[PDB]
Amino acid sequence: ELGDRKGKIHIPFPLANVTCRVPKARNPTVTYGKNQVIMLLYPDHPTL
Amino acid sequence: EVEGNSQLQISFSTALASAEFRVQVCSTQVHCAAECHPPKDHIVNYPAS
Known part of the structure; x- marks a missing residue:
């Protein structure tokens, strides 16, 4: 015995943009050559 | 700096x-x-003219 009769209440914990502290990949073993650069990459996790 | 009868040393590229x-x-x-x-x-590690 009701159609679309409804109420509304405000809800806690909203989404908000913040700041996160991440890390940085370790520097690779770099060796120079004639117009070329050689890098020995050692990643702990998938690194781009 | 100049004075009279002297010389000067300059660096050039x-x-x-x-x-x-x-x-x-x-x-x-x-x-x-x-x-x-x-x-x-x-191969060098700095740019030039």
């Missing part, structure tokens, strides 16, 4: 092996003769 260049000190020009030699490294 070039790419040519045989370099004939004019240096304008104050308002008068002087001809410089230089036979530059190749460097030990083929």
Whole structure:
């Protein structure tokens, strides 16, 4: 015995943009050559 | 700085092996003769003109 009769209440914990502290990949073993650069990459996790 | 009868030491950069260049000190020009030699490294870590 009701159609679309409804109420509304405000809800806690909203989404908000913040700041996160991440890390940085370790520097690779770099060796120079004639117009070329050689890098020995050692990643702990998938690194781009 | 200049005074009278003296000399001056200057540092210069070039790419040519045989370099004939004019240096304008104050308002008068002087001809410089230089036979530059190749460097030990083929690849450098800083840009130039």
